[PDB]
RNA sequence: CGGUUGAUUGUUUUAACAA
RNA sequence: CGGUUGAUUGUUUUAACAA
């Protein structure tokens, strides 16, 4: 798995914007938000599922990494059991095609 | 000692998961060690609310700096706070306690803020290692805050439903976090 | 009023009570060495304070040479229409000592 | 690459690699994460990236690692 | 090193504010003390003077000067504010105790209470 | 979608605080309104109820419920706090205007002023 | 009291007055679509407000289907011991309209 | 409108170089554009002091957020501040003004904070480019603040020595900074 | 000249500690502090002269650098007209031999 | 090394180098500063460092620079 | 996202405004 | 560093404490 080092403030802004756009703005209401307690991995902060046709794009935010504790983001395309690591550049187009500032993977992932 | 009962009841509710308490209220009192006994400071106690950019811990630090406490005396500071201190607040309180060895701090928390977050866990552990005492606010300190910091106008304290169960659950969570 | 100060009176320095004792000693030594900083001595039993403002801010002296580890203070002042003197001394370590009024 | 986590650091690296049940980080802000399978020195890992099945192989004493299809 | 010696009575911030507000109220709203001159802090060469009230008594004047940013006191709330009262005539100044100052004020001049130096300077933390 | 309809009089924060303090003062300090029941905000299933005052009138009760965190009003200081007054008897509730509520209070019950609903609910920003 | 509301009365929506008008329209549409959020309508000339709390918080309806670009509101309530109805309508664009009391 | 005269005289002294003014005082007033005329808001005006970690600009931003100003109305906000905003304060005010186009801001400064610092110069220039009007507080606005925000109890305003000279010098410095 | 990129907060802490130790603490009272207006270079924030016997160590803080405006520190030993660029490691010993935390070049310069 | 200050950036580099009266930065947080003499592409600069007279020489299109005694 | 609230949703943040 | 103040020195930061 590829994890990009990110500050906690950017993670908080990302999760706040995601919650806003699936609940209040409802522009991304089709998305799913999985909390920490629904994940078996103790290091996973949160999961964001973006439905893309049959497939789905999963953005997983991690906390408690020893990179002194660090946080990270992992983008992963999922076609049923099939999975693939995705760079932010591909995720930008993948989100723009099928879909407060909009929640963009590039802004959160960029250093 | 000027706090309306509605604010206290809303903010100091001890339910472990409370989603619409966006402000942090911190009541503080200071005691001085004189002749081997801890005498309360009547005018060195109060309560402060929170701002989006200014947390109550920073305001209390500024108040302590303005108080000009004698360095040759021992002070014991009791806190009653609705949310447990965040990472930045715990960090700053830890370094302040390290730089101020003549004052000790005990903290009672109505709720644990992000008790499932590893970052908040290490912040709380560092604050505890700095010498601060972290406790869960039970019915006794709730009544003490009602009769001391709350402008109840003589009204008796009315505990909310499930106060003891929430207190026990938060005590267990705090014991797990602090690795007692 | 005069008798209360003349009979029993003790003075102490509390310029920086939030700082460590060594830093307090250093600050007091500096303020006594150069006349660019005020020095205040508080009566222990009351709120009375004797402040030595520099002459630029408006036979009175503060000195260390009389005794090692001690500060001696002489302050003539006209109080209630009668001239009086304030004689005091505080030692370096404890920043405490004896100060009292006399007739000159 | 470089490990992120001196004698205590290398002892932790060694016992974490020998026993497992922990996460291992290798930064390049790109970083490779090694998680235990229950949560779901030479390093070799098959991983699908951008639709192709690339394999990341490297070594650490600091070290060097690269991905090849 | 030349020094200027003044007897300053340490008084907490609340009493200083109450004294200032009472004096200003009795100078303009209830003009009983309308002859009192209130000189501000920027008119004095002393950098640690907060306020200065001049009370004309005959051909002399009773000056009550309140200081801020002084050295901390022994008590908790003696944070660096004080009051010094003096009586000056023809460039001859003598320090005056608060009781004598109040006696002079009541001799020459005499609901919100009237401004009294004794209440301002009294130490409520030492008794 | 099923809705519950209530007439809420928008009142600024200062008047809400004054009403609460006056009611609590007359409940415990000056026990003229000692029969009034003050139910706190956590005893109501409505998440936007700040306070609830029960006034027994015979076998019925006049309930004055103050709400916080409502929608903003047209005026500047209608920031989301309001008051609704109703009269209930045997699970039959009817909304009551503030004037009628004050008339009932003075009929059954009647220095800090006595708590009046008309003063609390009157709009000082629209007149 | 009844005549003041019955004779002349106009209502408007001011739920989020600090937000742009399009966001206000979207928020009002959402709150009307799902009965999980309160909707308040303020009389322009007074401080009177009609609040439609969800039934979970304790023949009254809010609807959009009657006319495109309009919201129709029916609220029966017992006021001062007599049952009355509140009939209102506000259009989508301006978040404003007419609302008044009648006898049912 | 509750400000003691001593605080105003000490903090709002307009000497360009003032070394012992460690706190920032900001008086604010708001006007609303109704029927083509600007009507003053009597209850939307006041004054706020500064904290070591909390600047008055952030407190004013929080107050504006709490005010719930209508987005369909034009607001004109006048500031009278003892020190010109720092880099962080100018940054935050610039982004707030960019995100709030329905409100305009005019600022009068008693003194220019670090007017020789290039960082503060670019901060002030960015704040001006964001739409804020920066002016030097002359005798007229000093008298206005004395009669409006200062609890003078009817006492007349007493200007300090060299007020006009300091105002002219600060006007020249501000003109040089803003590249008029 | 060698300039190390530093945040403005560290520069402020350095200048505050230097002023403290030459004025109040008087542990470094022999040092000299040259302000911006006494320097011909418009980019110089401040200068700190540390007398080291006959020679002197000059620490110059710069602002307004286009590195978007950046600040920097330059350490330079001076023996009369002779001058030399000095790394923080040598300056540590040079200060410790002849002389709130103490003002250390390494802490300010380190990234 | 790399210049710190795209078309506007290179135009500013060019005219600043041609005319002068400005500071030029070259980061490696070590950085080389070129100041006009009145304040007191190939790059060459004599400079005394740690008691020795080293000479720093480099080139920029980004670039490469090194110091040699 | 006023809910088996996972907590920066529309903040509930205020010593006297009716002494 | 209360000074030809170059400004995070010992902050001067407070609506009623004597209504
Ligand atoms: Zn916090
Ligand atoms: Zn600022």
mmCIF file of N, CA and C in Angstrom, chain H residues 47-147:
data_model
loop_
_atom_site.group_PDB
_atom_site.id
_atom_site.type_symbol
_atom_site.label_atom_id
_atom_site.label_comp_id
_atom_site.label_asym_id
_atom_site.label_seq_id
_atom_site.Cartn_x
_atom_site.Cartn_y
_atom_site.Cartn_z
ATOM 1 N N UNK H 47 -15.747 47.333 21.210
ATOM 2 C CA UNK H 47 -14.292 47.314 21.226
ATOM 3 C C UNK H 47 -13.813 46.015 21.856
ATOM 4 N N UNK H 48 -12.688 45.513 21.350
ATOM 5 C CA UNK H 48 -12.089 44.271 21.828
ATOM 6 C C UNK H 48 -10.593 44.482 22.014
ATOM 7 N N UNK H 49 -10.050 43.910 23.083
ATOM 8 C CA UNK H 49 -8.620 43.951 23.340
ATOM 9 C C UNK H 49 -7.958 42.704 22.758
ATOM 10 N N UNK H 50 -6.663 42.563 23.015
ATOM 11 C CA UNK H 50 -5.858 41.514 22.414
ATOM 12 C C UNK H 50 -5.337 40.554 23.472
ATOM 13 N N UNK H 51 -5.099 39.318 23.049
ATOM 14 C CA UNK H 51 -4.400 38.321 23.841
ATOM 15 C C UNK H 51 -3.106 37.919 23.148
ATOM 16 N N UNK H 52 -2.205 37.324 23.931
ATOM 17 C CA UNK H 52 -0.916 36.901 23.396
ATOM 18 C C UNK H 52 -1.080 35.888 22.272
ATOM 19 N N UNK H 53 -2.112 35.051 22.345
ATOM 20 C CA UNK H 53 -2.387 34.070 21.306
ATOM 21 C C UNK H 53 -3.616 34.411 20.478
ATOM 22 N N UNK H 54 -4.466 35.314 20.966
ATOM 23 C CA UNK H 54 -5.709 35.689 20.302
ATOM 24 C C UNK H 54 -5.660 37.175 19.968
ATOM 25 N N UNK H 55 -5.534 37.489 18.684
ATOM 26 C CA UNK H 55 -5.526 38.869 18.230
ATOM 27 C C UNK H 55 -6.952 39.393 18.076
ATOM 28 N N UNK H 56 -7.145 40.714 18.173
ATOM 29 C CA UNK H 56 -8.508 41.262 18.062
ATOM 30 C C UNK H 56 -9.166 41.001 16.720
ATOM 31 N N UNK H 57 -8.385 40.816 15.654
ATOM 32 C CA UNK H 57 -8.968 40.545 14.344
ATOM 33 C C UNK H 57 -9.707 39.212 14.329
ATOM 34 N N UNK H 58 -9.131 38.183 14.955
ATOM 35 C CA UNK H 58 -9.806 36.890 15.027
ATOM 36 C C UNK H 58 -11.081 36.976 15.858
ATOM 37 N N UNK H 59 -11.037 37.721 16.964
ATOM 38 C CA UNK H 59 -12.236 37.908 17.772
ATOM 39 C C UNK H 59 -13.318 38.640 16.989
ATOM 40 N N UNK H 60 -12.932 39.646 16.202
ATOM 41 C CA UNK H 60 -13.912 40.342 15.377
ATOM 42 C C UNK H 60 -14.480 39.428 14.299
ATOM 43 N N UNK H 61 -13.646 38.554 13.730
ATOM 44 C CA UNK H 61 -14.149 37.595 12.751
ATOM 45 C C UNK H 61 -15.166 36.652 13.384
ATOM 46 N N UNK H 62 -14.886 36.186 14.603
ATOM 47 C CA UNK H 62 -15.847 35.351 15.316
ATOM 48 C C UNK H 62 -17.137 36.113 15.602
ATOM 49 N N UNK H 63 -17.021 37.385 15.988
ATOM 50 C CA UNK H 63 -18.208 38.199 16.232
ATOM 51 C C UNK H 63 -19.035 38.368 14.963
ATOM 52 N N UNK H 64 -18.371 38.583 13.826
ATOM 53 C CA UNK H 64 -19.077 38.706 12.553
ATOM 54 C C UNK H 64 -19.784 37.402 12.210
ATOM 55 N N UNK H 65 -19.108 36.272 12.418
ATOM 56 C CA UNK H 65 -19.734 34.980 12.157
ATOM 57 C C UNK H 65 -20.959 34.774 13.041
ATOM 58 N N UNK H 66 -20.891 35.231 14.293
ATOM 59 C CA UNK H 66 -22.034 35.107 15.192
ATOM 60 C C UNK H 66 -23.145 36.100 14.870
ATOM 61 N N UNK H 67 -22.814 37.224 14.228
ATOM 62 C CA UNK H 67 -23.815 38.255 13.973
ATOM 63 C C UNK H 67 -24.871 37.790 12.982
ATOM 64 N N UNK H 68 -24.529 36.831 12.120
ATOM 65 C CA UNK H 68 -25.445 36.310 11.104
ATOM 66 C C UNK H 68 -25.946 37.428 10.192
ATOM 67 N N UNK H 69 -25.007 38.182 9.630
ATOM 68 C CA UNK H 69 -25.367 39.273 8.737
ATOM 69 C C UNK H 69 -26.008 38.732 7.465
ATOM 70 N N UNK H 70 -27.053 39.415 7.003
ATOM 71 C CA UNK H 70 -27.736 39.009 5.783
ATOM 72 C C UNK H 70 -26.796 39.111 4.590
ATOM 73 N N UNK H 71 -26.777 38.066 3.763
ATOM 74 C CA UNK H 71 -25.915 38.051 2.589
ATOM 75 C C UNK H 71 -26.453 38.905 1.448
ATOM 76 N N UNK H 72 -27.726 39.300 1.495
ATOM 77 C CA UNK H 72 -28.331 40.114 0.451
ATOM 78 C C UNK H 72 -28.284 41.604 0.772
ATOM 79 N N UNK H 73 -27.487 42.000 1.763
ATOM 80 C CA UNK H 73 -27.335 43.396 2.137
ATOM 81 C C UNK H 73 -25.860 43.768 2.118
ATOM 82 N N UNK H 74 -25.601 45.054 1.913
ATOM 83 C CA UNK H 74 -24.248 45.590 1.881
ATOM 84 C C UNK H 74 -23.899 46.162 3.247
ATOM 85 N N UNK H 75 -22.734 45.787 3.762
ATOM 86 C CA UNK H 75 -22.262 46.240 5.060
ATOM 87 C C UNK H 75 -20.939 46.973 4.899
ATOM 88 N N UNK H 76 -20.777 48.054 5.656
ATOM 89 C CA UNK H 76 -19.534 48.811 5.700
ATOM 90 C C UNK H 76 -19.047 48.812 7.141
ATOM 91 N N UNK H 77 -17.860 48.261 7.370
ATOM 92 C CA UNK H 77 -17.322 48.073 8.710
ATOM 93 C C UNK H 77 -16.140 49.012 8.888
ATOM 94 N N UNK H 78 -16.208 49.852 9.914
ATOM 95 C CA UNK H 78 -15.135 50.774 10.252
ATOM 96 C C UNK H 78 -14.365 50.242 11.453
ATOM 97 N N UNK H 79 -13.041 50.223 11.326
ATOM 98 C CA UNK H 79 -12.124 49.781 12.364
ATOM 99 C C UNK H 79 -11.293 50.958 12.847
ATOM 100 N N UNK H 80 -11.026 50.992 14.148
ATOM 101 C CA UNK H 80 -10.081 51.925 14.755
ATOM 102 C C UNK H 80 -9.174 51.078 15.639
ATOM 103 N N UNK H 81 -7.949 50.839 15.187
ATOM 104 C CA UNK H 81 -7.056 49.882 15.823
ATOM 105 C C UNK H 81 -5.752 50.581 16.185
ATOM 106 N N UNK H 82 -5.210 50.239 17.356
ATOM 107 C CA UNK H 82 -4.005 50.907 17.838
ATOM 108 C C UNK H 82 -2.779 50.505 17.026
ATOM 109 N N UNK H 83 -2.643 49.219 16.716
ATOM 110 C CA UNK H 83 -1.557 48.712 15.888
ATOM 111 C C UNK H 83 -2.124 48.196 14.576
ATOM 112 N N UNK H 84 -1.411 48.456 13.482
ATOM 113 C CA UNK H 84 -1.816 47.910 12.198
ATOM 114 C C UNK H 84 -1.726 46.383 12.236
ATOM 115 N N UNK H 85 -2.603 45.689 11.509
ATOM 116 C CA UNK H 85 -2.645 44.223 11.605
ATOM 117 C C UNK H 85 -1.322 43.582 11.208
ATOM 118 N N UNK H 86 -0.984 42.497 11.900
ATOM 119 C CA UNK H 86 0.247 41.762 11.641
ATOM 120 C C UNK H 86 0.079 40.916 10.381
ATOM 121 N N UNK H 87 1.087 40.095 10.075
ATOM 122 C CA UNK H 87 1.047 39.286 8.860
ATOM 123 C C UNK H 87 -0.117 38.302 8.886
ATOM 124 N N UNK H 88 -0.261 37.555 9.983
ATOM 125 C CA UNK H 88 -1.341 36.577 10.079
ATOM 126 C C UNK H 88 -2.703 37.259 10.063
ATOM 127 N N UNK H 89 -2.835 38.368 10.795
ATOM 128 C CA UNK H 89 -4.108 39.080 10.840
ATOM 129 C C UNK H 89 -4.469 39.657 9.478
ATOM 130 N N UNK H 90 -3.499 40.265 8.790
ATOM 131 C CA UNK H 90 -3.765 40.797 7.457
ATOM 132 C C UNK H 90 -4.123 39.683 6.485
ATOM 133 N N UNK H 91 -3.412 38.557 6.563
ATOM 134 C CA UNK H 91 -3.726 37.389 5.744
ATOM 135 C C UNK H 91 -5.168 36.941 5.946
ATOM 136 N N UNK H 92 -5.561 36.741 7.208
ATOM 137 C CA UNK H 92 -6.895 36.236 7.508
ATOM 138 C C UNK H 92 -7.970 37.237 7.111
ATOM 139 N N UNK H 93 -7.725 38.529 7.335
ATOM 140 C CA UNK H 93 -8.697 39.533 6.919
ATOM 141 C C UNK H 93 -8.820 39.581 5.402
ATOM 142 N N UNK H 94 -7.706 39.400 4.687
ATOM 143 C CA UNK H 94 -7.755 39.397 3.230
ATOM 144 C C UNK H 94 -8.576 38.226 2.710
ATOM 145 N N UNK H 95 -8.334 37.021 3.236
ATOM 146 C CA UNK H 95 -9.113 35.882 2.753
ATOM 147 C C UNK H 95 -10.577 35.987 3.170
ATOM 148 N N UNK H 96 -10.855 36.539 4.357
ATOM 149 C CA UNK H 96 -12.240 36.746 4.768
ATOM 150 C C UNK H 96 -12.949 37.731 3.846
ATOM 151 N N UNK H 97 -12.280 38.828 3.489
ATOM 152 C CA UNK H 97 -12.881 39.802 2.585
ATOM 153 C C UNK H 97 -13.080 39.211 1.195
ATOM 154 N N UNK H 98 -12.141 38.375 0.743
ATOM 155 C CA UNK H 98 -12.314 37.703 -0.540
ATOM 156 C C UNK H 98 -13.505 36.752 -0.508
ATOM 157 N N UNK H 99 -13.701 36.049 0.607
ATOM 158 C CA UNK H 99 -14.821 35.130 0.747
ATOM 159 C C UNK H 99 -16.121 35.818 1.146
ATOM 160 N N UNK H 100 -16.077 37.101 1.508
ATOM 161 C CA UNK H 100 -17.265 37.864 1.899
ATOM 162 C C UNK H 100 -17.268 39.159 1.091
ATOM 163 N N UNK H 101 -17.852 39.111 -0.105
ATOM 164 C CA UNK H 101 -17.868 40.271 -0.987
ATOM 165 C C UNK H 101 -18.983 41.256 -0.662
ATOM 166 N N UNK H 102 -19.921 40.892 0.211
ATOM 167 C CA UNK H 102 -21.015 41.789 0.558
ATOM 168 C C UNK H 102 -20.656 42.762 1.672
ATOM 169 N N UNK H 103 -19.473 42.635 2.270
ATOM 170 C CA UNK H 103 -19.036 43.510 3.350
ATOM 171 C C UNK H 103 -17.709 44.140 2.948
ATOM 172 N N UNK H 104 -17.604 45.452 3.129
ATOM 173 C CA UNK H 104 -16.381 46.199 2.883
ATOM 174 C C UNK H 104 -15.832 46.713 4.207
ATOM 175 N N UNK H 105 -14.519 46.917 4.254
ATOM 176 C CA UNK H 105 -13.828 47.264 5.489
ATOM 177 C C UNK H 105 -12.950 48.487 5.274
ATOM 178 N N UNK H 106 -13.093 49.478 6.150
ATOM 179 C CA UNK H 106 -12.163 50.596 6.238
ATOM 180 C C UNK H 106 -11.470 50.525 7.591
ATOM 181 N N UNK H 107 -10.163 50.771 7.606
ATOM 182 C CA UNK H 107 -9.350 50.626 8.806
ATOM 183 C C UNK H 107 -8.600 51.926 9.054
ATOM 184 N N UNK H 108 -8.709 52.445 10.274
ATOM 185 C CA UNK H 108 -7.873 53.529 10.761
ATOM 186 C C UNK H 108 -6.926 52.953 11.802
ATOM 187 N N UNK H 109 -5.640 53.259 11.668
ATOM 188 C CA UNK H 109 -4.609 52.731 12.552
ATOM 189 C C UNK H 109 -3.992 53.891 13.322
ATOM 190 N N UNK H 110 -3.886 53.728 14.642
ATOM 191 C CA UNK H 110 -3.195 54.728 15.447
ATOM 192 C C UNK H 110 -1.697 54.695 15.185
ATOM 193 N N UNK H 111 -1.136 53.503 14.993
ATOM 194 C CA UNK H 111 0.276 53.335 14.696
ATOM 195 C C UNK H 111 0.439 52.259 13.634
ATOM 196 N N UNK H 112 1.554 52.322 12.914
ATOM 197 C CA UNK H 112 1.895 51.311 11.923
ATOM 198 C C UNK H 112 2.822 50.284 12.562
ATOM 199 N N UNK H 113 2.377 49.032 12.604
ATOM 200 C CA UNK H 113 3.141 47.965 13.237
ATOM 201 C C UNK H 113 4.185 47.434 12.263
ATOM 202 N N UNK H 114 5.460 47.611 12.608
ATOM 203 C CA UNK H 114 6.580 47.139 11.793
ATOM 204 C C UNK H 114 6.485 47.674 10.366
ATOM 205 N N UNK H 115 6.287 48.989 10.250
ATOM 206 C CA UNK H 115 6.174 49.607 8.934
ATOM 207 C C UNK H 115 7.462 49.500 8.130
ATOM 208 N N UNK H 116 8.591 49.247 8.787
ATOM 209 C CA UNK H 116 9.865 49.040 8.115
ATOM 210 C C UNK H 116 10.105 47.582 7.740
ATOM 211 N N UNK H 117 9.245 46.670 8.187
ATOM 212 C CA UNK H 117 9.411 45.250 7.908
ATOM 213 C C UNK H 117 8.831 44.927 6.537
ATOM 214 N N UNK H 118 9.609 44.348 5.618
ATOM 215 C CA UNK H 118 9.037 43.971 4.314
ATOM 216 C C UNK H 118 7.873 43.003 4.412
ATOM 217 N N UNK H 119 7.912 42.058 5.356
ATOM 218 C CA UNK H 119 6.805 41.119 5.509
ATOM 219 C C UNK H 119 5.522 41.845 5.887
ATOM 220 N N UNK H 120 5.616 42.789 6.822
ATOM 221 C CA UNK H 120 4.436 43.552 7.207
ATOM 222 C C UNK H 120 3.979 44.457 6.070
ATOM 223 N N UNK H 121 4.923 44.958 5.267
ATOM 224 C CA UNK H 121 4.542 45.765 4.112
ATOM 225 C C UNK H 121 3.741 44.951 3.105
ATOM 226 N N UNK H 122 4.188 43.730 2.790
ATOM 227 C CA UNK H 122 3.424 42.927 1.839
ATOM 228 C C UNK H 122 2.097 42.486 2.442
ATOM 229 N N UNK H 123 2.057 42.244 3.756
ATOM 230 C CA UNK H 123 0.783 41.928 4.397
ATOM 231 C C UNK H 123 -0.203 43.085 4.269
ATOM 232 N N UNK H 124 0.255 44.311 4.532
ATOM 233 C CA UNK H 124 -0.612 45.478 4.392
ATOM 234 C C UNK H 124 -1.031 45.687 2.941
ATOM 235 N N UNK H 125 -0.105 45.482 2.001
ATOM 236 C CA UNK H 125 -0.433 45.642 0.589
ATOM 237 C C UNK H 125 -1.459 44.610 0.139
ATOM 238 N N UNK H 126 -1.322 43.365 0.602
ATOM 239 C CA UNK H 126 -2.302 42.334 0.277
ATOM 240 C C UNK H 126 -3.659 42.653 0.888
ATOM 241 N N UNK H 127 -3.672 43.160 2.123
ATOM 242 C CA UNK H 127 -4.934 43.553 2.742
ATOM 243 C C UNK H 127 -5.600 44.682 1.961
ATOM 244 N N UNK H 128 -4.810 45.653 1.499
ATOM 245 C CA UNK H 128 -5.354 46.731 0.680
ATOM 246 C C UNK H 128 -5.873 46.208 -0.655
ATOM 247 N N UNK H 129 -5.143 45.277 -1.275
ATOM 248 C CA UNK H 129 -5.572 44.705 -2.546
ATOM 249 C C UNK H 129 -6.834 43.867 -2.389
ATOM 250 N N UNK H 130 -7.056 43.298 -1.203
ATOM 251 C CA UNK H 130 -8.265 42.528 -0.946
ATOM 252 C C UNK H 130 -9.515 43.394 -0.905
ATOM 253 N N UNK H 131 -9.366 44.716 -0.881
ATOM 254 C CA UNK H 131 -10.485 45.634 -0.842
ATOM 255 C C UNK H 131 -10.575 46.457 0.423
ATOM 256 N N UNK H 132 -9.782 46.139 1.442
ATOM 257 C CA UNK H 132 -9.805 46.910 2.675
ATOM 258 C C UNK H 132 -9.184 48.283 2.461
ATOM 259 N N UNK H 133 -9.783 49.295 3.081
ATOM 260 C CA UNK H 133 -9.271 50.657 3.039
ATOM 261 C C UNK H 133 -8.483 50.916 4.318
ATOM 262 N N UNK H 134 -7.205 51.248 4.169
ATOM 263 C CA UNK H 134 -6.318 51.499 5.299
ATOM 264 C C UNK H 134 -6.032 52.992 5.346
ATOM 265 N N UNK H 135 -6.315 53.607 6.490
ATOM 266 C CA UNK H 135 -6.112 55.033 6.687
ATOM 267 C C UNK H 135 -5.398 55.262 8.010
ATOM 268 N N UNK H 136 -4.818 56.449 8.144
ATOM 269 C CA UNK H 136 -4.135 56.848 9.368
ATOM 270 C C UNK H 136 -5.112 57.629 10.234
ATOM 271 N N UNK H 137 -5.211 57.241 11.502
ATOM 272 C CA UNK H 137 -6.185 57.826 12.416
ATOM 273 C C UNK H 137 -5.732 59.228 12.811
ATOM 274 N N UNK H 138 -6.417 60.244 12.292
ATOM 275 C CA UNK H 138 -6.095 61.635 12.577
ATOM 276 C C UNK H 138 -6.867 62.094 13.813
ATOM 277 N N UNK H 139 -6.850 63.403 14.077
ATOM 278 C CA UNK H 139 -7.525 63.934 15.257
ATOM 279 C C UNK H 139 -9.030 63.703 15.207
ATOM 280 N N UNK H 140 -9.620 63.715 14.010
ATOM 281 C CA UNK H 140 -11.070 63.590 13.893
ATOM 282 C C UNK H 140 -11.552 62.227 14.376
ATOM 283 N N UNK H 141 -10.922 61.150 13.899
ATOM 284 C CA UNK H 141 -11.323 59.822 14.356
ATOM 285 C C UNK H 141 -10.904 59.561 15.798
ATOM 286 N N UNK H 142 -9.839 60.207 16.279
ATOM 287 C CA UNK H 142 -9.521 60.120 17.703
ATOM 288 C C UNK H 142 -10.641 60.713 18.548
ATOM 289 N N UNK H 143 -11.144 61.886 18.152
ATOM 290 C CA UNK H 143 -12.268 62.490 18.860
ATOM 291 C C UNK H 143 -13.521 61.633 18.735
ATOM 292 N N UNK H 144 -13.743 61.045 17.558
ATOM 293 C CA UNK H 144 -14.902 60.178 17.365
ATOM 294 C C UNK H 144 -14.840 58.960 18.279
ATOM 295 N N UNK H 145 -13.663 58.342 18.395
ATOM 296 C CA UNK H 145 -13.499 57.209 19.300
ATOM 297 C C UNK H 145 -13.669 57.631 20.753
ATOM 298 N N UNK H 146 -13.155 58.810 21.111
ATOM 299 C CA UNK H 146 -13.326 59.309 22.470
ATOM 300 C C UNK H 146 -14.798 59.510 22.807
ATOM 301 N N UNK H 147 -15.567 60.069 21.873
ATOM 302 C CA UNK H 147 -16.972 60.356 22.133
ATOM 303 C C UNK H 147 -17.884 59.166 21.868
#
